[PDB]
Design an enzyme around this catalytic site. Structure first.
Site, short mmCIF file in Angstrom:
data_model
loop_
_atom_site.label_atom_id
_atom_site.label_comp_id
_atom_site.label_asym_id
_atom_site.label_seq_id
_atom_site.Cartn_x
_atom_site.Cartn_y
_atom_site.Cartn_z
N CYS B 37 0.86 -1.20 0.00
CA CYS B 37 0.00 0.00 0.00
C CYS B 37 0.90 1.25 0.00
O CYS B 37 2.08 1.17 0.36
CB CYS B 37 -1.07 -0.11 1.08
SG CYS B 37 -0.44 0.18 2.75
N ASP B 39 0.67 3.74 1.72
CA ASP B 39 0.85 4.08 3.16
C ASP B 39 1.98 3.22 3.75
O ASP B 39 1.72 2.43 4.66
CB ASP B 39 -0.48 3.90 3.90
CG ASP B 39 -0.90 5.13 4.67
OD1 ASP B 39 -0.07 5.64 5.48
OD2 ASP B 39 -2.07 5.57 4.46
N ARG B 41 5.49 2.06 5.78
CA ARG B 41 5.96 2.21 7.19
C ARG B 41 7.46 1.91 7.27
O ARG B 41 8.16 2.51 8.12
CB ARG B 41 5.19 1.24 8.10
CG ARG B 41 3.70 1.55 8.24
CD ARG B 41 3.41 2.79 9.07
NE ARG B 41 1.99 3.11 9.02
CZ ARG B 41 1.39 3.83 8.07
NH1 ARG B 41 2.07 4.33 7.05
NH2 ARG B 41 0.08 4.03 8.14
N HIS B 93 -1.10 -4.27 5.53
CA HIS B 93 -1.04 -4.09 7.00
C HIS B 93 -2.31 -3.39 7.46
O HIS B 93 -3.03 -2.84 6.59
CB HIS B 93 0.23 -3.35 7.38
CG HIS B 93 0.38 -1.99 6.80
ND1 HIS B 93 -0.30 -0.88 7.31
CD2 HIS B 93 1.20 -1.53 5.82
CE1 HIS B 93 0.04 0.19 6.63
NE2 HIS B 93 0.97 -0.18 5.71
N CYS B 96 -3.32 0.62 6.50
CA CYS B 96 -3.60 1.29 5.19
C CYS B 96 -5.06 1.77 5.29
O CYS B 96 -5.97 0.96 5.60
CB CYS B 96 -3.31 0.47 3.92
SG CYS B 96 -1.87 -0.64 3.94
#
Lengths: 216, 201
Positions: B37, B39, B41, B93, B96
């Site tokens: 995604c 988003d 990390r 995860h 998102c």
């Protein structure tokens, strides 16, 4: 028809590598995944090629979490791609990102694949967007006699036209009018030296220039 | 600021750490495509303890592989046919926000057609999800089923079916990345079964 075993153990080794990576982070910082899981709102959308060399955030010396990321073949922003248009819409309208960057480099295989007369099947329509960039700048590129300098200039004009495609979106035009963000930048990453270079896309001038044909 | 950080980053990479710029331009072939995604990390390569250069990457909202998306279909086609990647992974995860946005009845305009793909995953597994009473646990199962249906969409591609039939690679894997622990969890998808299932039609 069964999965070769070397592929199963290659896959297991990744999980072993992951467990080892977690242990060293636990040794260096005992609350690091606690801090990772702690909130954050990205300030950057970064659009790069799927042929990555270094994480965006690390080139830019930021935390991974400060950069919302999209990578695709030849770092394109095509008009009718709902994939990239959804990342731009979400980044602008939900994340309220302050910066959007398109970053290319001279070794994305996508741009090279665009210039081979080969049938790459499903790839042809995607890479057609790179050939449209050549058409928009045909005299400039025809007049560069060094093949490698011509190729390098195409890579840069592809970043610049991806940036223009971002600027032309309703989300970017409306956000910028009402809140004076985001701002769009075009950069090149040099693999040989590790240095970022600004293409100095004139955002204010480009945004004004676009308004005639493309306003809202 | 960014360019200052970049110059400083080049220094510590060439001072505080070893010089690997020859390796950066050395050239390598990725053995993995990773679909995650937008988003992010942690970089994919660092979760997987590999060099950045061993992992060809795509990130999009809610780690989707929709049938008619030329963007993701072009990364899959290139990874399989040009890079001859041996593994494709879809990694989700629980943070998102695309999946969460798909469950609110709000009009997200241009996003509705993209996130419709997430709602189709709810419909394919409606009984399973309806039986989970805890909102949070139901959401977490949707994230996992969304990974698994993205993986099934990879397996269904002409590129993966033809490559696997003629050369016995690539293999597809679905993972969930847990941000709290940093550990990958295998979703143990039915790769052989999906491939057999595709031939029934």
């Amino acid at each position: 028809d069964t999965v070769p075993q070397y592929l199963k153990q290659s896959h297991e080794r990744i999980f072993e590598n992951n467990r080892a990576w977690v242990a060293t982070k636990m040794k260096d910082d005992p609350a690091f995944f606690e801090k990772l899981s702690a909130g954050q709102t990205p300030e950057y959308l970064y659009i790069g090629c799927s042929d990555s060399r270094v994480p965006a955030n690390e080139i830019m010396g930021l935390e991974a979490g400060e950069v919302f990321v999209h990578r695709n073949i030849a770092n394109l922003v095509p008009n009718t791609d709902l994939n990239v248009m959804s990342v731009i819409n979400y980044a602008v309208r939900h994340l309220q990102v302050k910066h959007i960057v398109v970053c290319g480099h001279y070794h994305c295989g996508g741009v090279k694949a665009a210039l081979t007369p080969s049938d790459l099947g499903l790839l042809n329509p995607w890479l057609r967007n790179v050939r449209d960039v050549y058409r928009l700048h045909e005299q400039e590129l025809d007049g560069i006699q060094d093949a490698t300098a011509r190729y390098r200039r195409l890579v840069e004009l592809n970043v610049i036209e991806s940036c223009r495609n971002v600027i032309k979106t309703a989300a970017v035009q409306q956000s910028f009018h009402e809140r004076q963000f985001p701002v769009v930048h075009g950069w090149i990453f040099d693999v040989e030296t590790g240095l970022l270079r600004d293409l100095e896309i004139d955002f204010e001038e480009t945004l004004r220039d676009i308004k005639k044909i493309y306003n809202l």
